[PDB]
């Protein structure tokens, strides 16, 4: 559906998980597999302010 509906951008402490997710990422993001996904380009991929 729409990109940003419930996506929170806030900087949480994320867990580093071992399994690999990168496979088929951009294609499944473009066709629309999962709803409420957010893409951020290199200028906007940082820890947000508080």
């Amino acid at each position: 559906m729409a990109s940003n509906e419930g996506v929170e951008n806030r900087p949480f402490p994320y867990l580093t998980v071992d399994a690999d997710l990168l496979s088929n990422l951009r294609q499944s993001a473009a066709e629309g597999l999962f709803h409420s996904f957010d893409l951020l380009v290199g200028k906007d991929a940082r820890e947000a302010g508080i």
């Binding site: 806030r10 949480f12 402490p13 508080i50």
Partner: protein
């Protein structure tokens, strides 16, 4: 009237965001006033009627 003098505090009352509030600020984007107080009221004692 021969007083020409009062007495007041010399430094401001400090308030700082501790960790217990910092987690809520980071995740939920809200900070409570002196979380220690609400925790001593809610979780520690069952009644503690005011």
């Amino acid at each position: 009237e021969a007083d020409n003098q009062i007495m007041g505090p010399s430094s401001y009352a400090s308030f700082v965001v501790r960790g217990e509030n910092l987690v809520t600020a980071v995740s939920y984007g809200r900070v409570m006033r002196t979380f220690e107080h609400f925790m001593a009221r809610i979780v520690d004692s069952p009644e503690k009627a005011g």
